[PDB]
């Protein structure tokens, strides 16, 4: 019978890829359908480029793709419209914001699978050791805490110890981190939902200068090459007071044999001042049936399974990844394992989006401009003031003649 082939989630990031292959195999066994899994690269922008090769070829060789929240406007031609396959009641079981994000010109490109928001990981043991009672609320507090704890831990003999790790590599994850820096300084959304390119302002420049200030001081010099896993590995070995990362890192830090099990919490990222907005970049992944699949009915069935209550539950409990079903945030077993899901729900619902709606199919070009100009501040090549001016110009060229 058919072989249903799935591209999604990378075995190079946490346990995601192993778990996803497990779920696909479970569906195959349940339905008596042969299945195969195709591994993806760690970085989302690399995965996009890989999947674009299949799409350009109208290739039937992948039936189902795990797609990033920032992708629907790029990938819509390559997606089977799921709208006719779901009842209105079925669709309403997902967060409306994410169903809306995944709907492009009326086409439901993909079902919501898991959501994501950037958060602050912090070492509770180390805060207590050094006389702090709460995690930092302002970036200045984060810097002051990081300097004090680093001084102490280095004096105590840990030469691997840093104050703060984050994603500073030139790739999409830096766009995520930078949106949080800029938005939390009251510098705006880089490109506003209405199309205004707002980034050339002093608050956005300050945010970027601040982040440069961390490099080689409270964060490793090598942070300019860090993606999610490189940051996580410093953190997870016990060598960082603070980390910016996504929810998946929580379950990994709590696993048996983790050096930091039981020693951390999570909270909203800091902000410049009490009147700035909280910043948490909206992430997450969706499930797309390929427009080029020869087996749309079977592929839709698998996608519905993967996005189901019990599979999302298993993702939450085992991998601490955020459900796209509001009902799971009240499930006793989800909450018992991840109490912070309740505590930070408002952070997740107020997460700030990257400018993928407004940039539509040009988003990847816009983001490449953002991460390259930001990276030039991090590396010291440019000051924030010059970078936000140069970024304004670049985005203006990229989006000239584009309307949403
Ligand atoms: O790097 C930016 C990318 O980060 C997140 O995707 C991670 C995800 O949290 C992990 O659980 C796993 O699936 O790896 C993904 C990276 O391949 C965001 O969800 C995504 O929106 C964002 O672009």
UniProtKB/TrEMBL annotation:
Keywords, alphabetical: Signal, Transport
SUPFAM superfamilies given in the database record: Periplasmic binding protein-like II
InterPro entries membership: Bact_solute-bd_prot1, SBP
CDD domains hit by this protein: PBP2_TMBP
Source species, domain of life: Bacteria
Membrane as UniProt keyword: no
Short name of one Pfam family: SBP_bac_1
Family as reported in the entry's similarity comment: Belongs to the bacterial solute-binding protein 1 family.
Name this protein carries in UniProt: ABC transporter, periplasmic substrate-binding protein
Taxon lineage: Bacteria, Thermotogati, Deinococcota, Deinococci, Thermales
């Amino acid at each position: 019978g058919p072989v249903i082939r799935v591209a999604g989630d990378s075995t190079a990031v946490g346990e995601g890829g192993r778990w996803m292959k497990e779920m696909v195999e479970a569906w195959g066994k349940k339905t008596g359908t042969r299945v195969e899994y195709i591994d993806s690269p760690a970085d989302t922008n690399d995965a996009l480029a890989l999947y674009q090769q299949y799409w350009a070829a109208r290739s039937p060789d992948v039936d189902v793709y795990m797609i990033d929240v920032i992708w629907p406007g790029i990938v819509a031609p390559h997606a089977l419209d799921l709208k006719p396959y779901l009842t209105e009641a079925e669709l309403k079981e997902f967060f409306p914001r994410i169903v809306q994000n995944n709907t492009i010109r009326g086409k439901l490109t993909s079902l919501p699978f898991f959501t994501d928001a950037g958060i602050l990981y912090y070492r509770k043991d180390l805060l207590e050791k050094y006389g702090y009672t709460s995690p930092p609320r302002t970036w200045n507090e984060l810097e002051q805490m990081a300097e004090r704890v680093m001084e102490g831990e280095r004096r105590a003999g840990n030469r691997d110890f840093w104050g703060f790790v984050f994603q500073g590599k030139p790739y999409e994850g830096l766009t995520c981190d930078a949106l949080e820096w800029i938005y939390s300084h009251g510098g705006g959304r880089i490109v506003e939902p209405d199309g205004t390119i707002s980034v050339n302002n002093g608050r956005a420049a300050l945010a970027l200068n601040r982040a440069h200030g961390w490099v080689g001081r409270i964060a490793p010099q090598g942070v300019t090459s860090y993606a999610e896993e490189e940051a996580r590995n410093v953190w997870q070995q016990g060598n960082s007071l603070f980390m910016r990362n996504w929810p998946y890192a929580y379950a990994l830090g709590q696993a048996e044999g983790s050096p930091i099990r039981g020693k951390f919490g999570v909270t909203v990222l800091p902000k410049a001042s009490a009147d700035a907005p909280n910043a948490a970049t909206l992430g997450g992944w969706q499930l797309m049936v390929s427009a080029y699949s020869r087996y749309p009915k079977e592929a839709v069935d698998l996608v519905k399974y993967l996005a189901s209550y019990e599979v999302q539950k298993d993702n939450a409990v085992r991998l601490s990844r955020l459900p796209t079903r509001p009902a799971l945030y009240t499930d006793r077993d989800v909450l018992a394992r991840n109490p912070w899901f309740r505590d930070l729900l408002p952070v997740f619902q107020n997460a700030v989006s990257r400018p993928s709606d407004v940039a539509g199919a040009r988003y990847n070009q816009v983001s490449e401009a953002i991460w390259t100009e930001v990276h030039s501040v991090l590396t010291g090549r440019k000051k924030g003031e010059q970078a936000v001016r140069d970024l304004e110009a670049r985005i203006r060229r990229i989006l000239r003649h584009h309307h949403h």
